[model samples]
Target: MEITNLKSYKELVTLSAEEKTKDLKDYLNDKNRSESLIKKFKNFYMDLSRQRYSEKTLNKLVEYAEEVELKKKVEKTFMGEKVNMTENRSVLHTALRIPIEKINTHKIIIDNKNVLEDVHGVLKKIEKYSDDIRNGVIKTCKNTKFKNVICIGIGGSYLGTEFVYEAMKYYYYNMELNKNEKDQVNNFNNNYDQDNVFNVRFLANVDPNDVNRAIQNLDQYDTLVIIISKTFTTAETMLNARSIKKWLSLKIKDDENLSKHMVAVSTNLKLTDEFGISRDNVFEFWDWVGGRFSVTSSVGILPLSIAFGYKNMRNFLNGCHDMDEHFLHADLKENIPVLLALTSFYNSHFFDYKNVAILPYFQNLLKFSAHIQQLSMESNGKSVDRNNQPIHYNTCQVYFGEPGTNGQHSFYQLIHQGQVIPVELIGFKHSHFPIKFDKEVVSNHDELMTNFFAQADALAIGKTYEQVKEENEKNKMSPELLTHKVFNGNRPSTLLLFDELNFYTCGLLLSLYESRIVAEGFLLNINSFDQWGVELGKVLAKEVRNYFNDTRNQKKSNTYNFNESTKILLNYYLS
Candidate 1:
């Protein structure tokens, strides 16, 4: 049965329609509202009090979830059942984080093989490789220690790993550099020889300019390129890999030497061999893992383990496993990921809010919104039910955001006064670099936190016209100006606070959102693990690419089957 036909869902639809005009601040009147709405798991705290949800509303949403069998679906996912029915594959990214000691005992068997064993085996290989690279045991063809890592891939292979790398750089290597951020270039160049930390760059786009930007200042002999693609035939990834390989081979002549600086995360052994990456250097992940959900797998863990030590990656996985445990055991009311999904479901379906602004308060998480955008949208952006029948309902939102303070100056204007875009305000209680100045009244993080706290209330209990009028009474503003300055409050947002941003917290946040979207798919009766929508574009692009290649080679190119617009464009391009 469709979720929309459920009794609780129908009730929610009616209740939400009635509650649309209700003031959000009215729901916050109870003294126990915070304790009820703001729940904690380990170091993370989520406050839904500022959202347009009453206690009754939340209870009903939980009921909606229960009716959908969210608990059973979650358990099925954790147990490695083929929950992704369309693909006939088990969705078990959670198994990738199982503790090493518990691997044998807490095994999830798929196809007569233990997934935890595979996860740990790859993890061990990654740790060994990471150790070799860090300790100079694995050197370039010129016997030089690798100082740069260029990761080549697109989609999840690049986004999640890059996000974690960027975030971790802030915690480990960048705090001291933050003191003089503007002078970083001068500092880096001056201290180049003294610095032994590996600098990593991501090459994802097929654009030559992106490749150029990644390799411009790097010494080819001191760089290692990790190419990621499950089949090792991803067009963009292979093209970028070839481009970089050509650049590297121009300096170092032999395939053997080239293999020293290249590695892969792919299951296609033949393709890896042909691409000149040694079989030993090729890591593997399974088809059971979706691209967006493969971060806990080798795709992310390899690059992450290389950048931030393997131990930190282990901690990150531990954090992810902790969230998985919580997700499996926690009830609807106390569950974080479920609450996130249901609240999003409520807002999108009931109120018709179509966008979610993922506002993270730290600059380090600049790529986080992009990562979750792919995670949420790519996972749940479906029009059809699991049975392949079309349904009418909001499945996902246009997820977009930037770091705090930065976003405040940009789209926050639209969020504050224009269309009601639900906000996910992420904050950290402690800064990775806790710098204080005697010249300032409060610490730097405190200043950042003030905006974090203020935005929640400002969106909830917006400044009344009377309040604005009283404030501007001293200035004697015009009525036009008063109306212009008035802000209609009651915009909804959820606050996700963490102790700090680190590998563990990053893992926790990633797992929370990943599972949240899965629960969302279960509720909507959609298959979240399969993405058939992205295939059509790839198929069409191949034809266009073939045409482009024919034109470049000065061969007879067929535009006969092309649409009139495409034919004209192709003619213009060939000219």
Candidate 2:
């Protein structure tokens, strides 16, 4: 693939228009659209623009096209660029999976040293530590003392690891506790071996309710808490960490017991030491590894090793590395991430689809969908470009969805018959947890997948009034019912089918979307890493906390109506 350059602003202005209509026609066709359907896209764009929507959003769409022009220039083959500039380090989370000897480029330097070697060294340590723990060759926390692993981190720390842990549970063994071969097993069931299995929990939200609920039922003696904070300081995480420490002190009389049960995934050794974590208990992650991209780093190994064991975790990393190689080497048109990025950019910018729904049909991917939400939204949800110029355009559309069959019963009505929302449906050929019943009864897994396939097909090729009328006559149904059953048929959807949902395929699935986000960022000229927009809420929350906590500021409020529940909760907090 040849990387094209936009030498001037003039080139940027005409970027989308430079492409031939036929090129779009072919791409739409490849997206499962007919010729008539392709023509409708142009009309849709114009109609949405005239209805008082912002022109800046449309320019954002074109920015995506401009990013596509530099596909070859930004390819992963040139891996040494400072992709994430906020931290003043090279973005080489992708290099964590690649062998240190193989990565032989130096377009950028970090702290007067090679970054690739640093990533490789950490990965090797994670592998050795994971293996030692899994095989019972080495022990930091007593095996009899800690059996449960609870991960404490928000955003990237929680999202990626949560997805990987859930997806790999069905495949990997829990070496912490042995499972008898004679025990009945259902891979998809969350209830499997509930008592003995190493339970994994995540604490992401700062809401007191969320934190209290996580540690409510766990046994302190047999529980291990892995505090994951790259800087060893996140307000919510630290608050929750202190609360956990308080809780642990109440249960364990000895200070050494509390330290033994806790470990930290952080770079700041001084802070970790102050937080009561010993030097040996701290796992390191570099500045280059963004929170969202640190799943391949030590941030993920704790829960990953618990859920999938160390060997399977290694395989998962290997799978992600494979996708990285594919992204670096593949041509733009053929590249999965590049094409998805282009499609997403064109739809949002050129076609005026402000919201994108990613529907994964597999049940194992319910949490994965939320993880992608943080990755896409946090990375591209910016108002300013890298040059710090105010970008007057649409960036990331709201991303939300749930597992299908269940969603079909809940939200599919809104998606299908209500508003025209652009949808992307992902399906798997084989089930991660296939089920069989009596000879007379059919498999629920098959039924579930069939529903997914049918929905995707129906979304792309909907039934018209005429088609419904014909079916109605054949079934002898009422005319009113026939009219109601008719669908507008022009609704657009993209169907992505995976061979199966395993560790490797799941990694590829996630990496594919991550690359797409980067492409969208390039086109918008936005810094994908920095998130200044989040600061306002943080400041407001702190002010609100002060207002509520300050005894001097207390005043009677009767103007606003207060619900009984709110009054009760407030009284409890104040008390």
Give one digit per residue, the lDDT tens place, for model 2 in 1-575: 11123343344335444431223212333433332122111001101211111233334434445444555546532455666566555666776666555646532355677666776666667667556554555443344624577788889988999988777675444222333132232444334554335678898888988878878788777677889998877999988888877877777666666777788999899999998887767888877778887888888865686556666666677677776766666754345565566566665765566787877777777787788888889989888766666767788988988888767788888777887677777777666555656663567667777886577556545677888888876798878777678765445566666666666666677676766777677766677776667888897666546547553466642233447886688677777
Evaluated against the true structure, the overall lDDT of model 1 is: 0.87
Candidate 1 C-alpha lDDT tens digits along 321-342? 9998998999889999999999
In model 2, the runs with Cα more than 4 Å from the true position are 1-68, 76-78, 85-89, 100-109, 137-145, 173-196, 438-442, 474-482, 552-575
Candidate 1 vs. true structure, TM-score: 0.95
Residue 78 in candidate 2 has what lDDT? 42
Scored against the true structure, residue 46 in model 2 reaches a CA lDDT of: 7
Backbone clashes in each candidate structure, one number apiece?
Answer: 0, 4
* TM-score of each model, paired residue for residue: 0.95, 0.81
Q: Cα RMSD to native, each candidate?
A: 3.1, 7.7
Give Cα-based local distance difference scores for all models: 0.87, 0.65
